[PDB]
Design a binder for this molecule. Sequence first.
Ligand SMILES: Nc1ncnc2c1ncn2[C@@H]1O[C@H](COP(=O)(O)OP(=O)(O)O)[C@@H](O)[C@H]1O
Ligand SMILES: Nc1ncnc2c1ncn2[C@@H]1O[C@H](COP(=O)(O)OP(=O)(O)O)[C@@H](O)[C@H]1O
Ligand SMILES: [Mg+2]
Ligand SMILES: [Mg+2]
Lengths: 802, 802
Amino acid sequence: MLGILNKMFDPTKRTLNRYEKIANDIDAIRGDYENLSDDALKHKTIEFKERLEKGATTDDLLVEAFAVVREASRRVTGMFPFKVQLMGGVALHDGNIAEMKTGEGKTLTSTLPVYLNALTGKGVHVVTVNEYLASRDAEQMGKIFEFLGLTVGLNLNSMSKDEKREAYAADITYSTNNELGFDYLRDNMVLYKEQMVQRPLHFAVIDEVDSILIDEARTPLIISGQAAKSTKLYVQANAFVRTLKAEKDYTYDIKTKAVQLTEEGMTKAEKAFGIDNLFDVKHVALNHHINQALKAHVAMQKDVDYVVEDGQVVIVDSFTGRLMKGRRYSEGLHQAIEAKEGLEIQNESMTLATITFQNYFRMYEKLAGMTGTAKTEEEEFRNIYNMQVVTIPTNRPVVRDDRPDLIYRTMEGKFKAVAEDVAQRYMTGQPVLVGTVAVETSELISKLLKNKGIPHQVLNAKNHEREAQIIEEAGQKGAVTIATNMAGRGTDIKLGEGVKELGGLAVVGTERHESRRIDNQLRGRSGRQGDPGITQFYLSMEDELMRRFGAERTMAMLDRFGMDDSTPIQSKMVSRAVESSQKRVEGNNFDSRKQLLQYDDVLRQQREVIYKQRFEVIDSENLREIVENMIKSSLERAIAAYTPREELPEEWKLDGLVDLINTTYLDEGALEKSDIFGKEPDEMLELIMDRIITKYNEKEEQFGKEQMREFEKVIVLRAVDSKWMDHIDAMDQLRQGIHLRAYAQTNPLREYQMEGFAMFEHMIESIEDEVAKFVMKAEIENNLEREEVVQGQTTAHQPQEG
Amino acid sequence: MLGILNKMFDPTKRTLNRYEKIANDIDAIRGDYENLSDDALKHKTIEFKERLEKGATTDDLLVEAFAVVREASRRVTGMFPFKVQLMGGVALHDGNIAEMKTGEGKTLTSTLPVYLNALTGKGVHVVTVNEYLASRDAEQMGKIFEFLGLTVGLNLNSMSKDEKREAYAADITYSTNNELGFDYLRDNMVLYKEQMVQRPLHFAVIDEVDSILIDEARTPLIISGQAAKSTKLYVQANAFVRTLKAEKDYTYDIKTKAVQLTEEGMTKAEKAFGIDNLFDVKHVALNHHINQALKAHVAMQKDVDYVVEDGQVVIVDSFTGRLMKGRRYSEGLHQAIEAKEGLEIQNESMTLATITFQNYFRMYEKLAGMTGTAKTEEEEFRNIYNMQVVTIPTNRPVVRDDRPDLIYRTMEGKFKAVAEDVAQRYMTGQPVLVGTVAVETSELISKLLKNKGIPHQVLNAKNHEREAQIIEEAGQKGAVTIATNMAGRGTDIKLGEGVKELGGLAVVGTERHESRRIDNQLRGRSGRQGDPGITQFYLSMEDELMRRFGAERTMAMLDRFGMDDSTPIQSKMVSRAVESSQKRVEGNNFDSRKQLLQYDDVLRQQREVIYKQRFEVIDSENLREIVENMIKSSLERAIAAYTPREELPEEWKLDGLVDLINTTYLDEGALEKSDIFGKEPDEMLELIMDRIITKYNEKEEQFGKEQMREFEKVIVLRAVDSKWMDHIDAMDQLRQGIHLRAYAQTNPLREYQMEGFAMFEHMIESIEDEVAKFVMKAEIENNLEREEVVQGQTTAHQPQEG
Ligand SMILES: Nc1ncnc2c1ncn2[C@@H]1O[C@H](COP(=O)(O)OP(=O)(O)O)[C@@H](O)[C@H]1O
Ligand SMILES: Nc1ncnc2c1ncn2[C@@H]1O[C@H](COP(=O)(O)OP(=O)(O)O)[C@@H](O)[C@H]1O
Ligand SMILES: [Mg+2]
Ligand SMILES: [Mg+2]
């Protein structure tokens, strides 16, 4: 800029200069590889690899690495990277966004940093929007990476896990943002370590970040899976349950335990023909629904704990007394209550797993992306991913003529007008490209064109290859191309034979999109490196953008002033007005992302623990130790509840506790009055943990030393998986129900955090307990195989911006 | 923790261990300084200083540095830092929060990192809440710092700028958060570089961060100053103006210029007896009000640009047509319009300067703070200042008994009850400390105590020294102390003679504060390193905390259940309920800070430019270059407006532009038709910039070579200062008026950003222009002294949480 205002430019200027100098240091040694041998150059990779093991940094080997790559390309493709492209690669290396105007060769640039970071062999994900480009780039760019002798994988959904694994095994991988995501997702629902496809997230280079990180980032990734019409279980459970009402079927006033174990419950339960007493098949599976249905009656009371309704069952916020917006009870106790109250029980798809692009890409050791349009939301990138946008210079100065948006009083005037411009160019040789924003628009003008006898091609985003074929030639003399939402993104238009002197491309925007960014990408398609072009925008007072800006008063002045008379008008001020209109739209969306993120941050934290513990359970050599850590943490909880806030030491209630452990961790008489008397809550834990240890021991020598190691893993996964999957579905429900009935004054997100954490807290407890219960009591019958908890088929999708 | 949940603890555990090992590496070399000479030890500082110049890092010299400090203390104070205190210092060094429970010696700990970071001589700010502690700490802690031979300053408001400068000159400075802030503030309204007191922000160690960074952070710092009843000026301006209506007083249809320069305007203006034509006295000052009043009539039209009202004048959002919430016109053009419309013109204090504690402390190369209570809002610290809370272990294990909050159905039951507990302890020797939360509470119980014949002391935050004196002994046998909002914070209570066996302190909380954090600080005062104590909280159903949680339903159950009968009750669940009540309160406040911050972030960005340019103008050796950069950027703007979006090249309007420059940059005929013809907007800029250069030159050889260097600085400061101060006041207005009339759907903050940036944009333009105008046209008369723009006295204050 000029004058004062030029200091906002300072943080960019300073960096840009490092990068300029460096690009030069690179061009200096153009000689060092210029004349060399194909195989000598390949040995460079190795030299670097060695040099790295020794202790150097990617930053140290950067210049040379880039020089090598630079040579490698000319050799392979015949293209020798520009000084600007070198600057871009570096930017990328420094973990930033390389704003390199559409057509500066962002693809080739990726190679440099990609190559250099790939050397540690840690892996690099180069990502794009669609499977066409992904496969396209991999193929063309791979030949340089492979020449320098580096493995190159391509991940698509149509690939077996084994195929996927091989793709990820590569020194470098190409894939869609969606594939990456979903993979990470499925990757964490795996039963055995070897089934995961992904390798640790190292570095990701996102081609066209704005699209990925911004647009495709309005909603999250989900994996659903239904329940097998199970209803019949709860019905039967509820029925059965209210039978054995006696204290030969125990309960807790303190812990709220529905202790079935008694022979009344047991024997009369096995009577239900549960293939007798097979605790490991049954108890994990069937005895779960029972223990719920039991509590549902005993512990849960109609209008003190919950509430019955026409909208079904609600929870009552204790101590405030409220209709709990959207919250269900854990592990399907909600269903057991409905059965007990006869209400229709619901069985929808459960959300098995979820993460947001934002929280995903955040997961890498390093991220970087490239695109032409980004400074627009530099505030966002810098904020969320800590990537600063760097506007890389152009190779050749721009000479394209960007024309001021033309305004109209009607859609029909506007549209009808566009058809003429096309005509004029058409009848001169000028190749035209018209950008619509929706299907209808693109076909409306199609009619207007065929009517006027102008031959044309229409792109409406399907098998991008087909369109790409079409679009590449869209820059020839009789080129008349219609693009619905930049349908041929990434593929560049080269100025046709003789078209050079015909003017240039001359693209034409039928309207403006909700983002400058996107209508600016439209602009982008002309002037491909010094090439000439014209860009014309068309708008009308009856446009959605307009009639959403509350622009009626303005509509009236024109009308009242007979302005629809002079019709094609250019008011810098009205264009500025739409500029703000856009900024607002964008602002709203940024707000939407900002929110989506926040609700998930609550999740990511929860995932950190789970995911990690889960993984822990799969590198399961020495598992027992955790299993005991968990039994002990379950046990401690019992003790501390029978010994509340110092409520009279040996005057606690040292005889329910006694009878409990004795009945839920051990099997009747073993723990009694005497055993634990005159001991602090701490003293007691160890005493009995010890007798649990004694018992745990016993089982290793009675049911298989190392089979148990798997018993443990099975139980723990069964536990974790079952609990977790639930809580998540639960958490997805809450996240969109809390937005209902909330005069609480607080921000919902707040409630969410608080309530979310709470349940989580619970689930941990639940898990630890289930684990302890089974490992101590559960009985081995046949094959102790780690078993799947997902019922039936799954579905991996991204919802619609709703 | 135990069980699964223990992985949230991982990011803390990992760091805590580095710190434990290190503290040990330190204790290893206890011998190395153990036996040494007082003066040999002092030479260590030097050794380090040298060692540093050479190239070592504070991190490298840490152990030794700490060892030295550790020795230095025992020698000086006789206190040899605990392994825990060493861990704390490190934490601080790593730029984090050292959560070291109240009484772990946070003061002594500060020395270590303080010392070590001070060595570069870059400076260290150690900060606290009040001037007592600040002076106290400086004095006691200084003796160790000074022993190791390091300069130690103390900043108070009662100190001359020269005193302040000396305090800041020190290797280390102690001061209140408020003083620091205000200083930075005043520091940027300085006319000559040498008047600033502060030195570049290096490292700040905040004692009791939570108080500073959180509580004292709900509102911002302001500096106001009124206007000298000037009204008489605008009145006269408005009157005068509408006289010379002729084109011997020019205007612009394109630039909206109220060009007075003409002899009609000039001569008939000097007629107003403006001591003739003294352009430099008058034009800067008086001719400003004229040029406004002029535009007010010509350019500003009653109901197209603005609107008249009973609430005075409003702007009309162009192109949407709206009542501009809260926005005034720049440089007092708003006043000129009111005068032209006869409305009462307003003269309130203007907000001269502002920053938020958050955006201030953010300004350091490094920040760190210590306190007992912080994990509470670890999310905040980690977020805003990128400081992770580290809970440092206790030296000696805690044996204090924290009792479950006691609940009552009345304030009177609750209060009356508290007076008895006091009685019981009093009549046993137990020293009591009762925490109230407001003045009234503390005196209510005072009566209840004097009535019951129990002698007591009441603290209600005044001359903290006086209270500190009182409070230190508040731990003796007949100690009965009443603290309004922890009135004796920082000063620690030592267990009196024989009190050891009497139980301990036994503090008693009359109610709970809006933050656990604060009622937890109350708890903190007992058990000072293994010392015993009891902590009792008291609450009632008729408490504000309660009746803000919408806890009426709950009030009723008790009542309906005859619960006010059994009266003193402990429901873990109701205490949990208040826990949430607090979390909510806190959550609301965090939300309040989060917002305050955001509105200021818009500001900080603007400050970055201004502040920087201002400073630039004061290291004013080679200024001209900027002055031309600015004239040129003003000029470019004119050209580009007379040559709009390619609107027919030599068919622009090359003859108004011509006559303009010729009249606003130059003085009549010099620039004409021919001069600029057949030239691109770019070609023209240089042509004429050159003739401006020719003219600029002339003045250096006609009115003083280097006097001009000061002319330049004077003009530029006059400009900057005048414009800026305004815009800021303006910006403070907007920030609290935009919250009115806003159905716009967008979030206000958004509008604020957009509108804020806009005006800023304007002011830059305004500045550049004023500068150019004067430097080229303005005439030297007498003393060209940099002159103050602040009118009359100033006022530096922090508003109340409103
Ligand atoms: N160093 C180079 N030398 C010659 N041509 C290049 C070079 N780099 C890229 N190109 C060409 O320019 C076009 C732009 O590349 P592309 O990968 O599509 O980047 P962008 O995303 O910027 O349009 C490509 O079709 C390619 O053939
Ligand atoms: N290393 C030490 N050895 C003996 N006493 C110490 C040591 N460090 C601090 N103390 C004492 O313990 C008290 C706590 O110190 P203080 O600065 O008030 O810290 P805090 O903020 O944690 O209460 C001080 O009064 C001091 O006299
Ligand atoms: Mg591309
Ligand atoms: Mg202290």
